[PDB]
Amino acid sequence: NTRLRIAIQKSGRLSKESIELLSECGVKMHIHEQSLIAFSTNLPIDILRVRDDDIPGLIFDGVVDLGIIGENVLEENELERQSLGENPSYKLLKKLDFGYCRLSLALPQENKFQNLKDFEGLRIATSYPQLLKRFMKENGINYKNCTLTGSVEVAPRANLADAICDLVSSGATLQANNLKEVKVIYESRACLIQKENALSKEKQALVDKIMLRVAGVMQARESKYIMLHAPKEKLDKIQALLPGVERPTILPLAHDEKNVALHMVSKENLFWETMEALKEEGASSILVLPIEKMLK
Amino acid sequence: NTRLRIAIQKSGRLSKESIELLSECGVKMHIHEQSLIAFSTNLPIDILRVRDDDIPGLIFDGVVDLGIIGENVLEENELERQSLGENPSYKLLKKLDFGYCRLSLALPQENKFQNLKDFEGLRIATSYPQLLKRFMKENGINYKNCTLTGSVEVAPRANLADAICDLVSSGATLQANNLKEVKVIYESRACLIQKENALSKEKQALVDKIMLRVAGVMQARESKYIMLHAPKEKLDKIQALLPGVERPTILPLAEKNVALHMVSKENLFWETMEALKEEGASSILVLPIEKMLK
Amino acid sequence: NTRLRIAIQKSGRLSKESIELLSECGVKMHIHEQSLIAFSTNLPIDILRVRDDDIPGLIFDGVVDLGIIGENVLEENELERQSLGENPSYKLLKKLDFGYCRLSLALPQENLKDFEGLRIATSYPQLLKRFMKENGINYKNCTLTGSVEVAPRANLADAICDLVSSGATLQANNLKEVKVIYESRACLIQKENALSKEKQALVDKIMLRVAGVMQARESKYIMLHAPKEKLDKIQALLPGVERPTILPLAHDEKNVALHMVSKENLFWETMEALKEEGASSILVLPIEKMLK
Amino acid sequence: NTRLRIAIQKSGRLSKESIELLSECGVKMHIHEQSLIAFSTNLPIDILRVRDDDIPGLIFDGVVDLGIIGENVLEENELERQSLGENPSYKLLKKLDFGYCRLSLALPQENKFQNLKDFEGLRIATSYPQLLKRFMKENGINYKNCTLTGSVEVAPRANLADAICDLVSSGATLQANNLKEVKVIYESRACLIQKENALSKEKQALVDKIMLRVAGVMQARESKYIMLHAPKEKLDKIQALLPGVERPTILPLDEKNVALHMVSKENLFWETMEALKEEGASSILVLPIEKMLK
Amino acid sequence: NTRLRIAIQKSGRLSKESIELLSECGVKMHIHEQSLIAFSTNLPIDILRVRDDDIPGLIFDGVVDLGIIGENVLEENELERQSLGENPSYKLLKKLDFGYCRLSLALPQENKFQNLKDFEGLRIATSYPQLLKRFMKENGINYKNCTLTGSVEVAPRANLADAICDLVSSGATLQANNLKEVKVIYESRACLIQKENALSKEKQALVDKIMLRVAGVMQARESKYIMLHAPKEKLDKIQALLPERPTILPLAHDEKNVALHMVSKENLFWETMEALKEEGASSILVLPIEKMLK
Amino acid sequence: TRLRIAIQKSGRLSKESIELLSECGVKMHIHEQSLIAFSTNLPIDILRVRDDDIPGLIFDGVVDLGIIGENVLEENELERQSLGENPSYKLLKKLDFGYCRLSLALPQENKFQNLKDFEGLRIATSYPQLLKRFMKENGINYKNCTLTGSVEVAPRANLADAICDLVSSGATLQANNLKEVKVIYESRACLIQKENALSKEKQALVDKIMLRVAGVMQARESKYIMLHAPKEKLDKIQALLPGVERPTILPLAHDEKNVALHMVSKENLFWETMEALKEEGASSILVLPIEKMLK
Ligand SMILES: Nc1ncnc2c1ncn2[C@@H]1O[C@H](COP(=O)(O)OP(=O)(O)OP(=O)(O)O)[C@@H](O)[C@H]1O
Ligand SMILES: Nc1ncnc2c1ncn2[C@@H]1O[C@H](COP(=O)(O)OP(=O)(O)OP(=O)(O)O)[C@@H](O)[C@H]1O
Ligand SMILES: Nc1ncnc2c1ncn2[C@@H]1O[C@H](COP(=O)(O)OP(=O)(O)OP(=O)(O)O)[C@@H](O)[C@H]1O
Ligand SMILES: Nc1ncnc2c1ncn2[C@@H]1O[C@H](COP(=O)(O)OP(=O)(O)OP(=O)(O)O)[C@@H](O)[C@H]1O
């Protein structure tokens, strides 16, 4: 077909945010939970809703054009196919601002953990054998792999393994099974990827247009509009504290020769630490306003 | 009573946004789902929560002062009462910015649709007989009406009708019953209406005050505060692309470009953002507005 | 088509129990909430899932064969069509054992001739009208299709005539139930025009199943010990579907064992009355299916 | 350890019924959704709550004693391991009375299907490549496999395949994606299985005891206690209509009829009830049985 | 008033079963979550739905007639009022068949527990200070009380106490907070209680009637109707396995065996069914009983 | 050591208590079953407890900070005082949530003219101490009936003649045929601290958090305003709009009679103020939200 094909997760932790991103990029569509393919009404785009496990392979095989997938799953599949002698490839278009999670080694609460060497020779249960293997090789630790495709935290209490390597964000399931997180081995986030084989000129131009929108949407979520007063003597430090998307606008203050007004757009979000550092450097009247849309 | 009476939908697609609008207009009230009448604590206003079907009639009969109702239901009921020889009347105060939907003719997926004439002589099932009738009369198409008050999309597969005229927004229920949308006949949105008979001077003044607030609230939702850089050579085009509530503020930059600050009349879609970039605009920032009054 | 068409409520208070009844009558089907027609896999039957409001009309117009509908909605619509000069008709096959509710006049907590001249708000104008005409009371009708209990506090009416089962919504709006005017339950109805012989025979078969399913829910299998001297009184306390089976008890000459199937369910009052008459070892077992 | 280990699905279509069966077999335990091992309080049994996909492998590897799994998943995994040169083995203890589903070939609604040969050379998408392969080999049909681990019904509309081989029970998801079921290739239900390597004498005796309970629970669900009146003349015919677990008890009632008490081997359907009446039976009572043991 | 007043829990672990019991005793009423007092339509009875904490006090003060409350809350409050010099009193009418739980001492998983003496001098956190105190006194153990009205399992990790005394049924919350149950100090269930001061003759007669119904309802839940075949030679052993006198019936054309019909006093567990089979019993049927009265 | 903050586990204050801490830059992972959350970026432990216990934990010095409703705080303070104890604490900040009131209510049918109508009545409440203090202050004798919940049942069930109950909406009162008649106490959530001095390091952390709390609350209330004002009306317009700082006044290019005013309001802008500004000749009034602010 002439229409651009984008694979996203049908249901799971990435689904809502994947749809939201596309929608905020002006891709109008009607999604019914039972329908596995949504057709955009205003753009030549088909959204395929599939299991996240299959997204890397669909992209590697060139059967969809774009995909939104967690880095962890993308790499685990890439490594697996490489280990079977294949040469999977893809283009990473953008690391996205959701799907944050980590892959961590965990042990029974009772165990005494001092360092990574404590895993030497242990049986380790995981749904991510390749990612675990690569990390253990890099650190020169021998172990016995036990692959489980789910319910990984059962393994120690059930004597299937001595430890686990599992995905975590909150920590809940670990506590419930008498386990403690001990070492983060991998950090992941959602990515937007593209198949390796060149698209048609028209499809590629549509991807280019979307990508500009994606960057815009993400940048608007992170960036803030900042207004503050700064002493002229401290301007360079203040700017170093708050990196901007462009050069700051500097305006004279009418009744005041020692200070200036600074208007700028931050590259990153403003945390209280930064607000406090700015005040320490002599900044005052600091205002941070939200931005709904932007385009550099 | 001396208190102003406003009828809104108890529960349904208009309920949340009807309450939100009143709340954003400074009408403080405590609503609980089981209570059918909420009394405003800061203004002399009673909110009656009723079935949307009855709102037009309550207004026509002059028994409430204001109502928020979908256009589709308002006119269907107006037309129905006219067909019984009555003379319903009301004042349309404002078309609102929610309750968007459409009434559409639909056919079985298998049917070949070329033009409206393909509906000649067909049996058409609908919950909106009057709206359908008026549209078919305007376009000179004869048909057989089949009134169903719900589950309209069953009619073709159940051989109650050859086609349907139904409310749609998403399209889901049509696919599930092997139907395709083929012609939009009516587009609807929520409206704020008032009874025909004059109110007391005090009540009318309260309505006037609320109306100004309604316009403000709606404008603040649509309008955005825009900041961008524009080449001086392209300002006229840039301003045409983005109509404003007032004239833009133009500020010199620390050369051949200027800074433009303005308030858009409408919301900024990506197409506009892209058209501005094409015309040479850069550093385009769009900030939300919480309240406004010209 | 050759297939029998049954209209039931898509979603609402009658839906679950309508499907259950058909299912317990051996009508196998797969219902998906979004699908508005279910086809029976084991019988030539189509289930049309519609709004309850339309079921009477579909039956009156002969466009479906059977329907399950609340009596209240059935007669309200019958009366409405009669008032427009039409002559709706149907066959009442069976009053069912669910959908119980009542239509009641209610007044503000603070307050039949007392309704004389009052404004009365209702979603059932025809049923109210018929009742008020029968009792010779003049009133002013106010039709509301929902939220009826708002009317008094909102000064739309002086009283209401509304559907109730629990009473909750009345208390919440400072109203009290004052007079029941109509009692309703779900009914199974059929169109007036004769069916084909094959369709009618299928309906006849279903009807016997419906009766069986309902009787099994009400009837219980009863075993007890009774003194021979009190046997007549005990049998009078417990009407049965058949004559009781009477069995001698080993080594007890004054008493007998009684096994029977009750026509109605056994309430504690009956259990206590049986004990008063000298019955002992009373056992009540549930029945899953029956056919007399 | 001395305790018997049983693997069941953590969450999914088999979970509720797996727990119910064990509970009805007198295995007391407290399951918290977050806890992946439940310890029986009254028997030496550990319930491991896992992903269904892993249950066959845990059994093949002898690392749990019992498992409750769908036949489809069991044989798909058995076949997969055989294709890698392994020799997986297990004992099938009992086919259970839930988890009913089927694996079926399906095509777009528009396609003309006459025979299995119409699948010749087609791309077929499935989560059950091995089961599909075995069936296609048995019937001598060449095809191209496309493995998808979920959302299989997307494949045709997305041009990933020409057809699918997917699990169905209702049919809903097929309609929603413009597909029609065309050929059932495999029928499945939940099974209770055991590892191949011999258990201790104590563990095996516990399994034996549980198995008799499983059979009892399943028979009690199917069997009913029946009481009816039959004419003495029609007696032979009535018994033939109603196969029992034992011979019927016949009791005198007046002189022309008898009372019949019996336990049915199978459940009583309305057809049987109606056949009995036709043969002259009356006062037919069917009572539920909560527990039984032959 | 002339009407009998019964206090039950509005919402919580006892609420559903309290209502069910009354309903199964033929008390017809319409109970809506928003309504705090339900009036029985068929009997002169008012159901007050309150917080369980207050039920003992309402009974002690003679302000309601009956109450359904957990033993633990009843005695905790009794003890508390006694410690303030009051003399609370009540009549225990019946221990009921729901609301089962236990009050248990628990420690961090890491702690070595050998005996009760290990609690000597510890800080113990509990919502049931009086029940804990009575138990620690009866055993001569000194400790430091820490009263928390909820979230008791936080205390050790938060260094508010060294141990806890908390309500448990399913040990979930203990595991989640790295705690282990180590000594049950008190076992509880729901009870039906009555105020001490004599009721009117009419009210007391109504209570008497309800009590017989309560006993009947509970017995019907436990008792089962049993039918089996037994060898005449094993009849005594079989009857000893199954605690009124059984009905013994001859089997037609079988002289070595008899049919036994019994109503069990207790429920039949698999152990008993297996023991019956071991003694030569066969065709064992257990049917449910809906109502009974001796 | 680590700073200990007690908040409500689940209830009306729980969400907003967590949100406030989160908006103050306290990062933490809270799982509903977990009763103690450890901040990942600051030395802070969040204890999730029953609100009833928070005052006592603070009084006893066993946690450092607490977020609790005023009503529960003073009810417990009063209760402990009545047992001869001397509970004490520091009130750090009245917060912008947990708004409710304690009110006397009567059956709808009763005729209420004055507080004296409560003389000698039986009054049911979960807040005996707060009621007692109010009734003593106003010299009214009554009979207390303590109920720990379902207070609105008491009149219809003849447990009392009246109630003193927490309300925000009036829903539950209507449902039980009661009317609110006199507000006796107004409450909101408070952030409190134990009386005994903290270590210098812990106190400095509290000081830092407090400035953040004030910032977060100010950003919720304050708005960024832009408008046009006639030069002749500037003084009146500024009086209508108290600001956090002095307004910035800018000339308008094509217009000599008017100026542009940019400012940050101290309070939120209600329609009344917008309308008053317009009445005074202001035009093009824009109100933008503020996400964070520091003076
Ligand atoms: N707490 C979390 N927050 C954000 N993202 C997460 C979190 N946990 C996991 N993820 C990411 O989301 C991805 C999908 O998670 P999810 O649990 O929905 O996948 P799944 O269980 O494999 O679902 P399916 O296979 O049915 O698509 C993970 O691979 C990971 O990249
Ligand atoms: N998808 C939609 N989005 C927004 N508004 C809609 C949509 N569909 C319909 N509406 C509007 O909302 C009105 C009410 O629809 P809704 O389904 O809430 O009430 P209803 O079906 O009439 O139910 P009831 O009569 O019981 O309140 C419609 O008449 C129409 O004006
Ligand atoms: N407590 C009750 N209140 C109202 N109706 C009841 C009640 N109990 C049973 N019914 C029966 O159920 C029928 C349908 O009630 P329900 O509220 O489901 O339908 P509805 O309000 O007409 O909605 P719809 O128009 O969507 O089918 C009533 O006409 C009545 O016969
Ligand atoms: N309609 C159905 N669709 C799919 N499986 C069904 C159906 N009915 C019964 N089953 C059975 O249930 C088993 C488990 O299905 P389920 O969808 O719960 O697991 P899953 O999708 O593999 O999820 P998980 O991997 O989390 O255990 C299937 O292998 C099958 O044997």
Ligand SMILES: Nc1ncnc2c1ncn2[C@@H]1O[C@H](COP(=O)(O)OP(=O)(O)OP(=O)(O)O)[C@@H](O)[C@H]1O
């Ligand atoms: N696992 C359990 N945990 C606590 N109480 C239980 C448990 N099982 C049964 N109960 C009984 O339920 C009673 C209280 O139940 P529940 O926890 O619902 O009320 P509550 O928490 O005291 O709430 P309220 O005080 O608001 O009524 C206990 O006093 C006890 O008798």
Ligand SMILES: Nc1ncnc2c1ncn2[C@@H]1O[C@H](COP(=O)(O)OP(=O)(O)OP(=O)(O)O)[C@@H](O)[C@H]1O
């Ligand atoms: N409408 C309201 N009703 C009652 N309390 C409110 C209300 N609004 C705010 N609150 C505040 O929230 C506090 C706790 O409310 P909530 O009812 O959640 O706790 P609770 O019922 O005492 O539960 P727990 O004791 O189990 O924490 C009150 O003490 C009060 O300060």
Ligand SMILES: [Mg+2]
């Ligand atoms: Mg996955």
Ligand SMILES: [Mg+2]
């Ligand atoms: Mg409507």
Ligand SMILES: [Mg+2]
């Ligand atoms: Mg209806």
Ligand SMILES: [Mg+2]
């Ligand atoms: Mg699976």
Ligand SMILES: [Mg+2]
């Ligand atoms: Mg309690």
Ligand SMILES: [Mg+2]
């Ligand atoms: Mg509390």
